[PDB]
Design brief:
The protein is mainly beta. The chain has one domain (1-259). Helix content is 2%, strand content 51%. It is built from 1 helix and 21 strands. The protein has one helix at 61-66, and strands spanning 5-8, 12-16, 25-28, 42-46, 52-58, 71-79, 85-87, 90-94, 100-105, 110-116, 137-141, 144-149, 157-163, 170-179, 185-189, 192-196, 204-211, 217-224, 231-237, 242-247, 250-258. Strands 1, 2, 19, 20 and 21 form a 5-stranded antiparallel sheet that branches. A 4-stranded antiparallel sheet has the order 3-4-5-6. It has a 4-stranded antiparallel sheet with strand order 7-8-9-10, with no helix packed on it. It starts with a strand and ends with a strand. Bound molecules: calcium ion and sodium ion (NA). The site of calcium ion has 6 residues, from β15 and β19. This is Myocilin, C-terminal fragment.
């Protein structure tokens, strides 16, 4: 059931972090779960600080919302920023102070692939507008795995590449005209990249779209509310067809409607 994004609902708070380590972070579910995980399995990474390596895993939504993790993974190398995703049994994350994407198989705690994103800026060159070293943002949509970034050659405009999820090879690349540091975050739905105008405003918008099928860029005015005024992470989950976000200690989700 694919289509163009036409509406975003009110943010729903699922969990509020209890320490400043959780002011910003990423939380994720797998749109292609694999044993021993299910559609309920939830991963959470608080990303404040300089040696981020703990991943909280919750077998059940009840545990994610009301209780303790069922497992803590200690990543073998530290992680950068809020851009990570989980896809088909692996956490895909960026190595701290690097342009390297790492595929970490969760059930075996094994690194399966590492890839330098060619020419990608990193560590504060092309972050989203809030900073936070958000230069590299992974994404999953109905067609699989992508990475959102920029390069000097693109002069800071958003570049997106489709990734092979097994070995991280780039399969195809598109260059937009949207300055990455001028938008708060971005995500991909049904092959279209969407951006959010502000990470602070209760009256933000989903303000730009780039359709990878046609190469056409559009301006949009879809209301988007940052309930807690500091959104560090905004991603799309194509199985649930919802936005997942992290907003000033709060793990939130937004319903959407496609046309
Ligand atoms: Ca994102
Ligand atoms: Na992401």
């Amino acid at each position: 059931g694919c289509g163009e994004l036409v509406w975003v609902g009110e943010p729903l708070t699922l969990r509020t972090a209890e320490t400043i380590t959780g002011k910003y972070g990423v939380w994720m579910r797998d749109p292609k779960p694999t044993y021993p995980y299910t559609q309920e399995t939830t991963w959470r990474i608080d990303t404040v600080g300089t040696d981020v390596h703990q991943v909280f895993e919750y077998d059940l939504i009840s545990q994610f919302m009301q209780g303790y993790p069922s497992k803590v993974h200690i990543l073998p190398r530290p992680l950068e920023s809020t851009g990570a995703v989980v896809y088909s049994g692996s956490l895909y994350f960026q190595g701290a102070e690097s342009r390297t994407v790492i595929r970490y198989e969760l059930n075996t705690e094994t690194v399966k692939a590492e890839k330098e994103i060619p020419g990608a800026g990193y560590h504060g060159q092309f972050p989203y507008s809030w900073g936070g070293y958000t230069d590299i943002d992974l994404a999953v949509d109905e067609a699989g795995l992508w990475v959102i970034y920029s390069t000097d050659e693109a002069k800071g405009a958003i570049v997106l590449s489709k990734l092979n999820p097994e070995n991280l090879e780039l399969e195809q690349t598109w260059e937009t005209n949207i300055r990455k540091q001028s938008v708060a975050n971005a995500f991909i739905i049904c092959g279209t990249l969407y951006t959010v105008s502000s990470y602070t405003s209760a009256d933000a918008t989903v303000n730009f779209a780039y359709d990878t099928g046609t190469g056409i860029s559009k301006t949009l005015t879809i209301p988007f509310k940052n309930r807690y005024k500091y959104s560090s992470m905004i991603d799309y989950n194509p199985l649930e067809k919802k936005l997942f976000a992290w907003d000033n200690l709060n793990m939130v989700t937004y319903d959407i409607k496609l046309s």
